[PDB]
A paper describes a structure:
To assess the impact of our lattice engineering, we determined the structure of BMS-378806 in the improved lattice with the modified antibody fragments (termed 35O22_3T2S and 3H109L_MM). We observed almost identical unit cell dimensions as the original lattice, but with superior diffraction. Along the three principle directions a*, b*, and c*, diffraction improved from 5.1, 4.8, and 3.0 Å to 3.3, 3.1, and 2.3 Å, respectively, as judged by the UCLA anisotropy server, with the unique reflections increasing from 22,236 to 51,309. The resulting electron density maps showed superior density for many regions of the Env trimer. For example, residues 65–73 in the constant region 1 (C1) of gp120 could now be accurately modeled with histidine residues at positions 66 and 72 forming an unusual stacking interaction, which was modeled differently in prior structures. Another region of improved structure modeling occurred at the α9 helix of gp41, where weak electron density previously made placement of amino acid side chains ambiguous; the clear density in the new structure allowed unambiguous placement of amino acid side chains and correct registry of backbone atoms. It is important to note that the C1 region and the α9 helix did not directly contact the small-molecule inhibitor; thus the improved resolution of these regions was a consequence of the improved lattice, not an effect of small-molecule stabilization. While the real space correlation for BMS-378806 only improved from 0.91 to 0.95, the improved electron density did allow for greater structural certainty in placement of small-molecule atoms such as the methyl on the piperazine ring or the rotameric state of the oxoacetyl moiety. Overall, the engineered lattice allowed for substantially greater certainty in the positioning of both small-molecule compound and interacting Env-trimer side chains.
Numbering used by the authors:
A (entry chain L): 6 to 67, 67A, 67B, 67C, 68 to 95, 95A, 95B, 95C, ...
B (entry chain H): 1 to 82, 82A, 82B, 82C, 83 to 100, 100A, 100B, 100C, ...
C (entry chain G): 128 to 141, 150 to 185, 188 to 309, 312 to 321, 321A, 322 to 398, 409 to 458, 465
D (entry chain G): 184 to 185, 188 to 223
The structure:
Amino acid sequence: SYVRPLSVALGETASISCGRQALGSRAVQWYQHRPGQAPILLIYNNQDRPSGIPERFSGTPDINFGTRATLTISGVEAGDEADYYCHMWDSRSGFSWSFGGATRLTVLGQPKAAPSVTLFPPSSEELQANKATLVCLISDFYPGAVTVAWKADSSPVKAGVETTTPSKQSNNKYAASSYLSLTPMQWKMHKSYSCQVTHEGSTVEKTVAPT
Amino acid sequence: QVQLQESGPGLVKPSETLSLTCTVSGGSISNYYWSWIRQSPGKGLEWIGYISDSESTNYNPSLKSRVIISVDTSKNQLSLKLNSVTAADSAIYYCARAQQGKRIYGMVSFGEFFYYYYMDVWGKGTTVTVSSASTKGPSVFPLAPSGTAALGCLVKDYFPEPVTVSWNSGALTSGVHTFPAVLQSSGLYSLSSVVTVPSSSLGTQTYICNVNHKPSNTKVDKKVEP
Amino acid sequence: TLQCTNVTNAITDDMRGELKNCSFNMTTELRDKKQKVYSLFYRLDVVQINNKEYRLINCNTSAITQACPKVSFEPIPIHYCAPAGFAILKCKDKKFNGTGPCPSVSTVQCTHGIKPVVSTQLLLNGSLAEEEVMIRSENITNNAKNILVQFNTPVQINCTRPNNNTRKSIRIGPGQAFYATGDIIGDIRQAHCNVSKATWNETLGKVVKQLRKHFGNNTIIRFANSSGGDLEVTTHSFNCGGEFFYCNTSGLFNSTWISNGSNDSITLPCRIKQIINMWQRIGQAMYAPPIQGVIRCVSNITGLILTRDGT
Amino acid sequence: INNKEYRLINCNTSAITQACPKVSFEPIPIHYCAPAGF
Ligand SMILES: *[C@@H]1O[C@H](CO)[C@@H](O[C@@H]2O[C@H](CO)[C@@H](O[C@@H]3O[C@H](CO[C@H]4O[C@H](CO[C@H]5O[C@H](CO)[C@@H](O)[C@H](O)[C@@H]5O[C@H]5O[C@H](CO)[C@@H](O)[C@H](O)[C@@H]5O)[C@@H](O)[C@H](O[C@H]5O[C@H](CO)[C@@H](O)[C@H](O)[C@@H]5O)[C@@H]4O)[C@@H](O)[C@H](O[C@H]4O[C@H](CO)[C@@H](O)[C@H](O)[C@@H]4O[C@H]4O[C@H](CO)[C@@H](O)[C@H](O)[C@@H]4O[C@H]4O[C@H](CO)[C@@H](O)[C@H](O)[C@@H]4O)[C@@H]3O)[C@H](O)[C@H]2NC(C)=O)[C@H](O)[C@H]1NC(C)=O
Ligand SMILES: *[C@@H]1O[C@H](CO)[C@@H](O[C@@H]2O[C@H](CO)[C@@H](O[C@@H]3O[C@H](CO)[C@@H](O)[C@H](O)[C@@H]3O)[C@H](O)[C@H]2NC(C)=O)[C@H](O)[C@H]1NC(C)=O
Ligand SMILES: *[C@@H]1O[C@H](CO)[C@@H](O[C@@H]2O[C@H](CO)[C@@H](O[C@@H]3O[C@H](CO)[C@@H](O)[C@H](O)[C@@H]3O)[C@H](O)[C@H]2NC(C)=O)[C@H](O)[C@H]1NC(C)=O
Ligand SMILES: COc1ccnc2[nH]cc(C(=O)C(=O)N3CCN(C(=O)c4ccccc4)C[C@H]3C)c12
Ligand SMILES: *[C@@H]1O[C@H](CO)[C@@H](O[C@@H]2O[C@H](CO)[C@@H](O)[C@H](O)[C@H]2NC(C)=O)[C@H](O)[C@H]1NC(C)=O
Ligand SMILES: *[C@@H]1O[C@H](CO)[C@@H](O[C@@H]2O[C@H](CO)[C@@H](O)[C@H](O)[C@H]2NC(C)=O)[C@H](O)[C@H]1NC(C)=O
Ligand SMILES: *[C@@H]1O[C@H](CO)[C@@H](O)[C@H](O)[C@H]1NC(C)=O
Ligand SMILES: *[C@@H]1O[C@H](CO)[C@@H](O)[C@H](O)[C@H]1NC(C)=O
Ligand SMILES: *[C@@H]1O[C@H](CO)[C@@H](O)[C@H](O)[C@H]1NC(C)=O
Ligand SMILES: *[C@@H]1O[C@H](CO)[C@@H](O)[C@H](O)[C@H]1NC(C)=O
Ligand SMILES: *[C@@H]1O[C@H](CO)[C@@H](O)[C@H](O)[C@H]1NC(C)=O
Ligand SMILES: *[C@@H]1O[C@H](CO)[C@@H](O)[C@H](O)[C@H]1NC(C)=O
Ligand SMILES: *[C@@H]1O[C@H](CO)[C@@H](O)[C@H](O)[C@H]1NC(C)=O
Ligand SMILES: *[C@@H]1O[C@H](CO)[C@@H](O)[C@H](O)[C@H]1NC(C)=O
Ligand SMILES: *[C@@H]1O[C@H](CO)[C@@H](O)[C@H](O)[C@H]1NC(C)=O
């Protein structure tokens, strides 16, 4: 389904409106979901929340008809970044098979974090297999967006390189990989190889050579 | 007290019956509702169906014509059978316990109520890929190292996702960092795990890298040393 | 010709047809230009054609005239008076049968306040006897004469149409406006009435005691529900807040009494009509306009209209 | 109506009745009188 983006500043209070408004008395469930992970039922009955969920997650009760279903997250932290689903059940419409749209919450104002570049040379076993791979591993950066540049000696290398799109680590920073594949003769016939990782305004380099 | 764990083939050929299972630990299976949910890349959470405590079934009309949910009360296992799979059927398949809620707005004598279901405890997920391409175990290579230092383990050219990696058969846990894979143009994923250990530990704390790739039943080990 | 569909609430089986969502082509303020409009209609106000086509219930028997929505259907006490040179005599006998020599008599210029309440089976908001509970027919030994009972204690009844309706005006002609039912805000529930189960059992017993004096201290008398007829007479039909309810009363007359609850109440499922027919005439029918909001009226049952079959 | 189409001014608010053309609109002096005893 489509995704509706929402942005909340770090520490503020998030007001996530439900995708479909109720025609009658309702029973709305709120789910938290970060892709690549099992969803977390935040609130089941309009305002009832299960155990293990802080009081900062709140839903609106069905007292008088007219009030919309809104999930309220107070004191928003970087961990609150996920997709939030509104499972809407009411007396007029049928059986709620669909979970609905998806509010993509992003928390603004997080501290900027600089990468941790680490470059490895081709292992001897791989070189023994008539192949060779340079792996450039970038981690612990925020905002999650980098740019990698491979250079053979000083000339730039653009063929044979694969790079991961950033992925949020468990500590709310981002990590990326980059693999340069070259023949074992290209690895020997050059003096050194470099991985230049540019993040935000700056660029950082790690170099490795066959010694 | 109650935990769920999925299990699947990882890779299934197109136009073939997919099959998954889910195991309940701590609680029983014949006294709760259970739902199957999946999530494709780019597509949201999709409710597939559910089964009752009386083992009554009900499928999403989205895929009603080709889904069969079951249950084996002998050991708290419930299964899922989706046939005629296509490329769009590949996703993470979750398994969850559904709790029935009876919302009442009028008179229960006149049926002025409706039932809603909510999943309160999920599994972890089983990745499933639909592809004519064959399986292939990975090649593992040691990334020898040089305040502290960093060594690693290179897992290249496998299919399909995923691959689990532990260090020292599970003993080494602090400072481990396994990186998301990379889909090269060849069509095979290449991974990389890296731990940051104290420099003096080089002599001679052995570092065993445990690679596992179930869709090929090809586990391997390798040691790193300067 | 009406094109109708069921309106929402995939509710209990065969209660979705009880109200319908009907669209039709209607005249406008311009005689040559049609309009497609829609209105919500109760099931009792339409009939099929045999597809999902419908027509108003009255179209083959009567003309129809909608009530001017500013006039109140709420009964106001009327006092009947006699011209000068005449007089009204009142029988002050507290155990008066309705016929025969009344020993206590007074004269009045005008009768007491009488509300023109038209109800069926159960008499609403009427006057109460002071002792016991009288029973009046002209030939009680005749089963074809209706028995008129009159309570001394008021057994209360609460009725409601919980659905929050909306009225939508529709210009069907220059100066003419048809008031349609817009939609329902909130839930779609069932209109009904409550009467305390405790009081209705006690009051239904006092009727039994006085019925005995005409049929024997030993005989067994039984209450059963209506045995057919038009809808107005097979139900406790009445008007509440502007709507015309039609309440099933099988829960009120389902009791057998021998020769010689306390917490909850009994509920009466009522249906609702808008196109109500004239009672002793044909060709004339009235459309009661839709009442907006939630409806609830509170009244007392002060009498009944029973009928014997001839145990 | 918004072309050169038109409608009578009253069509959206009122019904209309044309005066019987034989009745005179010319005011005639009226005398108001009180009943006997007034
Ligand atoms: C004529 O006669 C007629 C016949 O008598 C009569 O009809 C009656 O009409 C009234 C109103 O028109 C009807 O009243 C409604 O009743 C609903 C049901 O209420 C009962 O059930 C609930 C829930 O029960 C479950 O949970 C409790 C624990 O909480 C358990 O103990 C139960 O066993 C049960 O749980 C098990 O069972 C489930 C299935 O069976 C399982 O799924 C579950 O897992 C468990 O196994 C009880 O909580 C109620 O208790 C309350 O009332 C009693 C009196 O009965 C009091 O002691 C006390 O006040 C209790 O609080 C009750 O027993 C109500 O839910 C309904 O009210 C809701 O709906 C309306 C409109 O939809 C809302 O406007 C209103 O605000 C209510 O919404 C709240 O609750 C819902 C549901 O949880 C929430 O989703 C919502 O967000 C909102 O929550 C907020 O308020 C809550 C409290 O209000 C609070 O908890 C929240 O935290 C939040 O703040 C409505 O009142 C009545 O049913 C009719 N009668 C019959 C027989 O049907 C008519 O009126 C008469 N008069 C006339 C016609 O004039
Ligand atoms: C009774 O039936 C009529 C049809 O004759 C229903 O009217 C239609 O209702 C739908 C659903 O609300 C309307 O579509 C909606 O339009 C809005 C505004 O663009 C849009 O935001 C929604 O996503 C949806 O598409 C439709 O316009 C409307 N048509 C007319 C002519 O009114 C009516 O809802 C039914 N009422 C009940 C109580 O069942
Ligand atoms: C029997 O008599 C009682 C009272 O004599 C009637 O109750 C009356 O019912 C009407 C309509 O149901 C009430 O009018 C309403 O008032 C409320 C509040 O002001 C307003 O929101 C509504 O729009 C409407 O105007 C009236 O107040 C109420 N009177 C009393 C004293 O409660 C009852 O309807 C009678 N029963 C029958 C069958 O006629
Ligand atoms: C529908 O009636 C009419 C329609 C059109 N032109 C009419 N000209 C006189 C009418 C009578 O007065 C009448 O026949 N009526 C019916 C009974 N009635 C009620 O209030 C009532 C109706 C249904 C259920 C319970 C009570 C009093 C009155 C409205 C009459
Ligand atoms: C019936 O529905 C109407 C609207 O269809 C409700 O009217 C609203 O009442 C609230 C009062 O809290 C006002 O703030 C709104 O402005 C009103 N809206 C409109 C459109 O008038 C009315 O409250 C409902 N009645 C019941 C008993 O729920
Ligand atoms: C009908 O409704 C009336 C009022 O809605 C009920 O009378 C109320 O009874 C309670 C008893 O606890 C009193 O506290 C209130 O003061 C009463 N209200 C009025 C306006 O008198 C009555 O009980 C209801 N009866 C039934 C059978 O439903
Ligand atoms: C309305 O619902 C009833 C009950 O489900 C069904 O029998 C009937 O055919 C329906 N009518 C229309 C017009 O959908
Ligand atoms: C209104 O008339 C048209 C013909 O011009 C017809 O097709 C349509 O079905 C009519 N509308 C309804 C609700 O019957
Ligand atoms: C009018 O039509 C209804 C359809 O149910 C029918 O029962 C009734 O007898 C008809 N009335 C006349 C006078 O033919
Ligand atoms: C009504 O009561 C009077 C009391 O004297 C009695 O004479 C008369 O027969 C009674 N009529 C009926 C029909 O019971
Ligand atoms: C009353 O009816 C019975 C038969 O039903 C009859 O024999 C008797 O004469 C009637 N009484 C009067 C006063 O007409
Ligand atoms: C019937 O019983 C009552 C007592 O409840 C008594 O007063 C009356 O005389 C009795 N009548 C007959 C005919 O037995
Ligand atoms: C009277 O009760 C019987 C019992 O089922 C029912 O079949 C019949 O429809 C009822 N009549 C009325 C008018 O409610
Ligand atoms: C009246 O209610 C009884 C049960 O309460 C039901 O069997 C009967 O069918 C109802 N009458 C009508 C006309 O529906
Ligand atoms: C009738 O139409 C005229 C067009 O000029 C408009 O000004 C007027 O408000 C309308 N009347 C009503 C009651 O809508």
